[PDB]
Amino acid sequence: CGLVASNLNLKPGECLRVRGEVAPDAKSFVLNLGKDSNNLCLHFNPRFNAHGDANTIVCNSKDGGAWGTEQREAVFPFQPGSVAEVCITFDQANLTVKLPDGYEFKFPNRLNLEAINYMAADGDFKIKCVAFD
Amino acid sequence: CGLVASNLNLKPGECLRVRGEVAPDAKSFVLNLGKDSNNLCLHFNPRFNAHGDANTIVCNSKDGGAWGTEQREAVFPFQPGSVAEVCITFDQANLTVKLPDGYEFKFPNRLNLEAINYMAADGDFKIKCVAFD
Numbered sequence A, B: 001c002g003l004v005a006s007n008l009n010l011k012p013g014e015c016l017r018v019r020g021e022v023a024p025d026a027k028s029f030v031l032n033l034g035k036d037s038n039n040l041c042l043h044f045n046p047r048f049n050a051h052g053d054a055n056t057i058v059c060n061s062k063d064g065g066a067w068g069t070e071q072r073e074a075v076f077p078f079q080p081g082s083v084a085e086v087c088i089t090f091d092q093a094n095l096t097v098k099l100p101d102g103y104e105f106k107f108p109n110r111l112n113l114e115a116i117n118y119m120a121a122d123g124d125f126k127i128k129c130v131a132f133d
């Protein structure tokens, strides 16, 4: 599957910027952030058509392997077969996700990690760049 | 200790660009590329003053945990404190390392890996950006 990065040491307030190519026939893509694959403060899942949703962003946490309560957004600034960029940061209370087209939303920080050490990508998205603050 | 990235799927001819800030008091830094931590097609180690060398790039391979034969460059386009970007690519014959100041050198491809899946950074270099093209 997609790129996996560890040992990231992203601190509160630091921005993690990811640019990638959405596949022409994309169904969805994922960015996961947290401590490890079983402990995610953010699962970020734009669904073009996948997992029972169309053109919807679904976010969740994972704690000791258990998905939390889902959150769905009402905006979908992504298109199959294009370049897309997202930027993420956090504090003890919320993650902030910066989308294309100036849209931004918050997702609650339910793990309270001191630092985000793990990121992974998956689905129909080819990472072109990852920038750290 | 720095970022570790896996599942990179870097293919021959593709460029991996890594940009970081060299510490103001830097002794050395490392970029490791290969299959996993024990199997490196390139250990890239600019030594300001470390491991017995001054202002020298040392490169090596690692196969099943064992270091190969060292290769030393004469060029040293790095300065303590300064941002630096290094770009790496490979073919079946050699890795090519593109340095600051327009310099490039080749290092033999000793492991014949189909793809480079692993990168890690270490020492006195704070990673700012990793790009794939």
Ligand SMILES: OC[C@H]1O[C@H](Sc2ccc(Cl)c(Cl)c2)[C@H](O)[C@@H](n2cc(-c3csc(O)n3)nn2)[C@H]1O
Pocket (backbone or CB within 6 Å): A027, A028, A029, A030, A043, A045, A050, A051, A058, A059, A060, A067, A068, A069, A070, A122, A123, A124
């Ligand atoms: O909540 C987020 C998750 O929702 C469901 S599981 C789920 C369903 C209903 C509820 Cl009420 C809950 Cl709490 C969880 C997805 O299957 C899962 N998911 C996508 C993928 C994936 C990997 S690569 C690709 O393109 N999609 N891997 N796991 C995840 O997005």
Ligand SMILES: OC[C@H]1O[C@H](Sc2ccc(Cl)c(Cl)c2)[C@H](O)[C@@H](n2cc(-c3csc(O)n3)nn2)[C@H]1O
Pocket (backbone or CB within 6 Å): B027, B028, B029, B030, B043, B045, B050, B051, B058, B059, B060, B067, B068, B069, B070, B122, B123, B124
């Ligand atoms: O060949 C490359 C290696 O040369 C010597 S061991 C070595 C010595 C003599 C010979 Cl003949 C051989 Cl074959 C191997 C270094 O100790 C080692 N090295 C650096 C570091 C390190 C980590 S972060 C930082 O800034 N430097 N961790 N291991 C590596 O550079």
